[PDB]
Enzyme design. Sequence first.
Site, PDB file in Angstrom:
ATOM      1  N   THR A 105       0.812  -1.206   0.000  1.00  0.00           N
ATOM      2  CA  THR A 105       0.000   0.000   0.000  1.00  0.00           C
ATOM      3  C   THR A 105       0.850   1.262   0.000  1.00  0.00           C
ATOM      4  O   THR A 105       0.317   2.352  -0.234  1.00  0.00           O
ATOM      5  CB  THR A 105      -0.924   0.014   1.220  1.00  0.00           C
ATOM      6  OG1 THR A 105      -0.178  -0.351   2.388  1.00  0.00           O
ATOM      7  CG2 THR A 105      -2.065  -0.975   1.036  1.00  0.00           C
ATOM      8  N   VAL A 152      -7.946  -4.198 -24.690  1.00  0.00           N
ATOM      9  CA  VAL A 152      -6.821  -4.813 -23.991  1.00  0.00           C
ATOM     10  C   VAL A 152      -6.452  -3.928 -22.809  1.00  0.00           C
ATOM     11  O   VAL A 152      -7.134  -2.936 -22.529  1.00  0.00           O
ATOM     12  CB  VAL A 152      -5.619  -5.037 -24.927  1.00  0.00           C
ATOM     13  CG1 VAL A 152      -6.058  -5.781 -26.178  1.00  0.00           C
ATOM     14  CG2 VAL A 152      -4.965  -3.712 -25.289  1.00  0.00           C
ATOM     15  N   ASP A 192      -2.399   7.345  -5.549  1.00  0.00           N
ATOM     16  CA  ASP A 192      -1.089   7.385  -4.913  1.00  0.00           C
ATOM     17  C   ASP A 192       0.008   7.912  -5.826  1.00  0.00           C
ATOM     18  O   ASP A 192       1.122   8.155  -5.352  1.00  0.00           O
ATOM     19  CB  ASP A 192      -0.697   5.991  -4.408  1.00  0.00           C
ATOM     20  CG  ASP A 192      -1.578   5.517  -3.269  1.00  0.00           C
ATOM     21  OD1 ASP A 192      -2.040   6.368  -2.480  1.00  0.00           O
ATOM     22  OD2 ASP A 192      -1.798   4.294  -3.156  1.00  0.00           O
ATOM     23  N   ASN A 241       6.449   5.052 -24.542  1.00  0.00           N
ATOM     24  CA  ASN A 241       7.442   5.847 -23.831  1.00  0.00           C
ATOM     25  C   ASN A 241       7.636   7.212 -24.481  1.00  0.00           C
ATOM     26  O   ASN A 241       8.753   7.726 -24.565  1.00  0.00           O
ATOM     27  CB  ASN A 241       8.770   5.096 -23.754  1.00  0.00           C
ATOM     28  CG  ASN A 241       8.609   3.687 -23.212  1.00  0.00           C
ATOM     29  OD1 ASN A 241       7.855   3.455 -22.268  1.00  0.00           O
ATOM     30  ND2 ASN A 241       9.318   2.736 -23.811  1.00  0.00           N
ATOM     31  N   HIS A 277      15.789  -7.504 -24.332  1.00  0.00           N
ATOM     32  CA  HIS A 277      14.554  -6.847 -23.914  1.00  0.00           C
ATOM     33  C   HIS A 277      13.477  -7.875 -23.583  1.00  0.00           C
ATOM     34  O   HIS A 277      12.824  -7.796 -22.535  1.00  0.00           O
ATOM     35  CB  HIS A 277      14.102  -5.900 -25.029  1.00  0.00           C
ATOM     36  CG  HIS A 277      12.823  -5.173 -24.758  1.00  0.00           C
ATOM     37  ND1 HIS A 277      12.778  -3.806 -24.594  1.00  0.00           N
ATOM     38  CD2 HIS A 277      11.544  -5.606 -24.659  1.00  0.00           C
ATOM     39  CE1 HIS A 277      11.529  -3.429 -24.394  1.00  0.00           C
ATOM     40  NE2 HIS A 277      10.760  -4.503 -24.425  1.00  0.00           N
ATOM     41  N   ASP A 329      -5.224   2.007 -18.569  1.00  0.00           N
ATOM     42  CA  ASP A 329      -6.026   1.280 -17.600  1.00  0.00           C
ATOM     43  C   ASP A 329      -5.389   1.225 -16.223  1.00  0.00           C
ATOM     44  O   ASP A 329      -6.109   1.165 -15.222  1.00  0.00           O
ATOM     45  CB  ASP A 329      -6.255  -0.151 -18.089  1.00  0.00           C
ATOM     46  CG  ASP A 329      -7.025  -0.205 -19.392  1.00  0.00           C
ATOM     47  OD1 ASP A 329      -8.181   0.264 -19.420  1.00  0.00           O
ATOM     48  OD2 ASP A 329      -6.467  -0.703 -20.393  1.00  0.00           O
ATOM     49  N   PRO A 388      -8.862  -0.208 -26.969  1.00  0.00           N
ATOM     50  CA  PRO A 388      -9.490  -0.112 -25.641  1.00  0.00           C
ATOM     51  C   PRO A 388      -9.737  -1.451 -24.962  1.00  0.00           C
ATOM     52  O   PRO A 388      -9.752  -1.501 -23.726  1.00  0.00           O
ATOM     53  CB  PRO A 388     -10.804   0.627 -25.930  1.00  0.00           C
ATOM     54  CG  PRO A 388     -11.105   0.326 -27.358  1.00  0.00           C
ATOM     55  CD  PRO A 388      -9.773   0.212 -28.049  1.00  0.00           C
ATOM     56  N   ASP A 411       7.886 -10.637 -27.973  1.00  0.00           N
ATOM     57  CA  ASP A 411       8.956  -9.654 -27.888  1.00  0.00           C
ATOM     58  C   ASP A 411      10.181 -10.128 -28.670  1.00  0.00           C
ATOM     59  O   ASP A 411      10.033 -10.715 -29.746  1.00  0.00           O
ATOM     60  CB  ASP A 411       9.265  -9.404 -26.410  1.00  0.00           C
ATOM     61  CG  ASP A 411       9.822  -8.029 -26.153  1.00  0.00           C
ATOM     62  OD1 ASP A 411       9.054  -7.164 -25.675  1.00  0.00           O
ATOM     63  OD2 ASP A 411      11.020  -7.816 -26.419  1.00  0.00           O
ATOM     64  N   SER A 424       7.433  -0.376 -21.235  1.00  0.00           N
ATOM     65  CA  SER A 424       7.743  -1.753 -21.554  1.00  0.00           C
ATOM     66  C   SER A 424       8.127  -2.625 -20.358  1.00  0.00           C
ATOM     67  O   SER A 424       8.067  -3.858 -20.455  1.00  0.00           O
ATOM     68  CB  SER A 424       8.891  -1.778 -22.526  1.00  0.00           C
ATOM     69  OG  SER A 424       9.260  -3.117 -22.745  1.00  0.00           O
TER      70      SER A 424
END
Length: 279
Positions: free
Chosen positions: A16, A177, A260, A161, A69, A200, A175, A39, A224
């Site tokens: 938290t 996914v 937060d 990014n 990556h 999301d 939208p 990837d 990523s």
Amino acid sequence: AAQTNAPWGLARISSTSPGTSTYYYDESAGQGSCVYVIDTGIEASHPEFEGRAQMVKTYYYSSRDGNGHGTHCAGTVGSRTYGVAKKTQLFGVKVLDDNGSGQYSTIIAGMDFVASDKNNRNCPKGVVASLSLGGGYSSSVNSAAARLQSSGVMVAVAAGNNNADARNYSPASEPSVCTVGASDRYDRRSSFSNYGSVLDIFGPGTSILSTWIGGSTRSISGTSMATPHVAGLAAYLMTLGKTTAASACRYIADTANKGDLSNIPFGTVNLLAYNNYQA
């Protein structure tokens, strides 16, 4: 289960509060689930994967991760030390060459591959696809991601990014996914993280330590690297029976840490992925 001196991102997703270093999780740890890492490949021989990772598809001369990556994202999904779901199965789909680049048609083919290949795998707790990739807007890349989601796979994709609205990127702007932004250890939006109404959730994205090729490790940054946290979390939550592939992103957002994060632009969700495990 308690992993002491875990990477900050793992500790964050079971906290938290920022600034702790123990990752807490139910021992089931994604057992019986599957995560496809679409990837640059996975170095399956990395001792961190314990034989749970393998390449299932490549579109290039080698299925080997010549970049690092894809290995790094896979390690954040399910490696023993750096992973969210430490007992999940990792299936590598090499759609990006060893430069990290790939044609949309190859990327689309890889998503359609996963939507069919899952029927060749034993994933009784369910299937996840982690797409730590993207480029400019493409309705055909969006639809491929929507099809993969529609087939019963939770799709987690990087928001991108570009420090911009993700609406102009694919598959981030699809939208249906689960589009993932990046945060840092101080609960700030990662300076590079895309944003917008299509996002999301946020996951740890800045200075994420994970596996690397040559059997090594390193810390790198990107939306990523936030995506495999959410992909791994989903497979963890699906193994626990708390959600399904069709509703995992919605569940993760429902149970996330609210409000937060700082420097979240007006209109972007202030939600940080949180496994909400009570030890």
